[PDB]
């Protein structure tokens, strides 16, 4: 179907302890493929997927220089935003940047985005037309005026509709064996009596990809959202994901409840009953 | 704006020179470009946050110095006459891949010579206005010739009663080669017939020549062609 | 990489000047137009980052991303516009402007009352020294050049005193 390439930047200032900590990571869909850590010994952009190691030495030299310059851009931005908010030199602060592009099944550009944060809340973001910015507060309005005068939106749009879409296609081609796959979840169910009159039914879903999935409970065919525990989707560590959903049922009525599993890799939504 | 030193520089084949460039605008990117008759603006170096971003000089003899902030000096070793050109330093507020405007420094004109013995200061001649022009057009055109200088490192100015003037002046934009190792340059200044007929007014053509520095070696058989001013002057006359 | 057209253009005062610039890099999405007067530094004239026309005074820049093409239109050309116009591009991801070979523009001033004359001038401080002055000739006149060795003829030099129609074309020859 659709596919995405996304980069995530994190810059954390360390007052009195040297340069800020800069970490960059690249994703194709839910699969990390590159990383840079400013505190690592290599001081290089590093591969994190087998299919990206095909790139020649020009690729890694280029990305290393480009991501190192980004670390300096954020270092200066930390100082500038530290002045915008009248903050002291002692506190540690964070800048986060997310950006990327999406392509449809025809391989053509579908959508682009870029979003920046400061201390874990919105700062500035490129609008969906890729021609204007939304600023979260008065400080970000200063950044917005600089970015308009410098034609940053047009420069960002030319990357999003050009090199981003182009290299995302090459990546999808190189890692065609693993990026274009849909592993269905393996489902089972556990039962734990908690008291003399109640019990816990837990519905499991393991080894699925991509990460999106819907685990819902029903009682006598009626969806029940009460007494429902639902943890976040977690990575198994091998590219697949895990999730479970549990309900507290009265003892003896366990067979009145059904679990329903919906995933992209399933030809028909699964139904489970104890 | 952007400071470049020196304005003119002469060197022998195989020596080393350093071109100084610094900006005090808080700009985070600095660049080097080269201007020749062949290519008017060949890109050389691109630096962001004092780190090397791109280099399109196929020679390792060009080595920028960016250890100090706001500076991007350029050292060139094993100089060759093909290196003769004007080197332009540039800066921009934002990093190199995102800048919206580049500001260019005033440039350093470098000439590399096979032998420094050919460096010669100019001879300056002042030609007085034709009496026919004063009679017919009631105007007087003085003409200043600078000849026999090498290399093409000259600045010509006109001085009337001790003040430099610009009105009524036209100077050749480029010097022309007389021979392989000598250039010539011309300029003219036009004043009134009344202003020329006043014996109080005197006109001086000044040619500032940029030659060898106080560190270059030179034999004791002739004066070394250092940076100097050569002038020619005349006074107005009622003739 | 960046191609400019034409290599030189002579326009009469008040006339139209059309300069062209194309690129072969598909990742070029914007252009810069720089101007450099003889002996000065190149200064930015116009930049354009989206398709369409952009007008500032007597200058209009056009951008055509499909054909990778930008054009600089100069209306009511003034003698002060005589300069080297340089087109520059910077493909997405690269870290510097890359300039073209430039278009040398020359705008000839309108001389209302041309009165061509040739005078001879002498240097009193040294004999065997005389030159010739061709002055106040029309702008369309072709000043001859020299192929002989030992003789020099300069290009047309326009001076302006503080007067009306004070513009005056000049050329110098000597041997």
């Amino acid at each position: 179907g659709s596919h995405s390439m996304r980069y995530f930047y994190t810059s954390v200032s360390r007052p009195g302890r040297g340069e800020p900590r800069f970490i960059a990571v690249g994703y194709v869909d839910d699969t990390q493929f590159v990383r840079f850590d400013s505190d690592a010994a290599s001081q290089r952009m590093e591969p994190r997927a087998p299919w990206i190691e095909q790139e020649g030495p020009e690729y890694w030299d280029q990305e290393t220089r480009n991501v190192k310059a980004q670390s300096q851009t954020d270092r200066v931005d930390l100082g500038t935003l530290r002045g915008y908010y009248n903050q002291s030199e002692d506190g540690s602060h964070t800048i986060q940047i997310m950006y990327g592009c999406d392509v449809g099944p025809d391989g053509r550009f579908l959508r682009g985005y870029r979003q920046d944060a400061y201390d874990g809340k919105d700062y500035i973001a490129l609008n969906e037309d890729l021609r204007s910015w939304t600023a979260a507060d008065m400080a970000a309005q200063i950044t917005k005026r600089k970015w308009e005068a410098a034609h940053a939106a047009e420069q960002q749009r030319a990357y999003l509709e050009g090199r981003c879409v182009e290299w995302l296609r090459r990546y999808l081609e190189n890692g065609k064996e693993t990026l274009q796959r849909t592993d269905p979840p393996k489902t089972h169910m556990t039962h734990h009596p908690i008291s003399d009159h109640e019990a816990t039914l837990r519905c499991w879903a393991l080894g699925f990809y991509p990460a999106e999935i819907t685990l819902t409970w029903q009682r006598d065919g009626e969806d029940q959202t009460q007494d429902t525990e639902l943890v976040e989707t977690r990575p198994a560590g091998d590219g697949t994901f895990q999730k479970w959903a549990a309900v507290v049922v009265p003892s003896g009525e366990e067979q009145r409840y059904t679990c329903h599993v919906q995933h992209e890799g399933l030809p028909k939504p699964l139904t489970l009953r104890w | 704006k952007i400071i470049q030193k020196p304005k003119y520089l002469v060197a022998v084949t195989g020596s080393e020179k350093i071109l100084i460039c610094e900006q005090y605008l808080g700009h985070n990117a600095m660049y080097w470009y080269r201007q020749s008759a062949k290519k008017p603006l060949e890109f050389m170096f691109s630096y962001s946050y004092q780190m090397l971003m791109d280099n399109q000089t196929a020679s390792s003899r060009f080595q920028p110095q960016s250890s100090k902030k706001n500076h991007l000096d350029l050292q060139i070793t094993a100089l060759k006459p093909d290196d003769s050109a004007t080197y332009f330093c540039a800066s921009s507020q934002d990093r190199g891949d995102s800048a919206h405007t580049l500001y260019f420094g005033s440039g350093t004109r470098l000439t590399v010579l096979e032998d420094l013995r050919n460096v010669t200061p100019p001879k300056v001649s002042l030609f007085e206005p034709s009496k026919a022009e004063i009679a017919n057009k009631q105007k007087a055109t003085l003409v200043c010739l600078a000849r026999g200088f090498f290399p093409d490192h000259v600045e010509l100015s006109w001085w009337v009663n001790g003040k430099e003037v610009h009105s009524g002046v036209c100077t050749d934009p480029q010097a022309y080669k007389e021979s392989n190792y000598s250039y010539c340059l011309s300029s003219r200044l036009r004043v009134s017939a009344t202003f020329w007929h006043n014996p109080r007014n005197h006109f001086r053509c000044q040619v500032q020549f940029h030659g060898l520095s106080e560190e270059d070696k030179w034999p004791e058989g002739s004066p070394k062609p250092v940076t100097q001013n050569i002038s020619a002057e005349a006074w107005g006359r009622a003739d | 990489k960046v191609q400019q057209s034409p290599e030189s253009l002579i326009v009469p005062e008040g006339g139209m000047a059309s300069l062209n610039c194309t690129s072969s890099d598909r990742n070029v999405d914007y252009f810069w137009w720089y101007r450099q007067h003889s002996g000065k530094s190149p200064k930015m004239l116009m930049s354009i980052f989206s398709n369409g026309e952009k007008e500032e005074g007597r200058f209009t820049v056009h951008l055509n991303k499909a054909s990778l093409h930008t054009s600089l239109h100069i209306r009511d050309s003034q003698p002060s516009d005589s300069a080297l116009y340089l087109c520059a591009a910077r493909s997405s991801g690269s870290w510097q402007l890359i300039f073209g070979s430039g278009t040398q523009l020359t705008v000839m001033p309108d001389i209302q009352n041309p009165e061509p004359a040739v005078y001879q001038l002498k240097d009193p401080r040294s004999q065997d020294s005389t030159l010739c002055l061709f002055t106040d000739f029309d702008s369309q006149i072709n000043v001859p050049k020299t192929m002989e060795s030992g003789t020099f003829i300069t290009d047309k030099c326009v001076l302006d005193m503080k007067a009306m129609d004070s513009k005056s074309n000049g050329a110098i020859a000597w041997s």
């Binding site: 980069y7 960059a24 690249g26 280029q62 410098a150 290299w167 | - | 997405s92 991801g93």
Partner: peptide, 9 residues
Amino acid sequence: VVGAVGVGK
């Protein structure tokens, strides 16, 4: 390939 535009904030 990375490509965040780096105009200073």
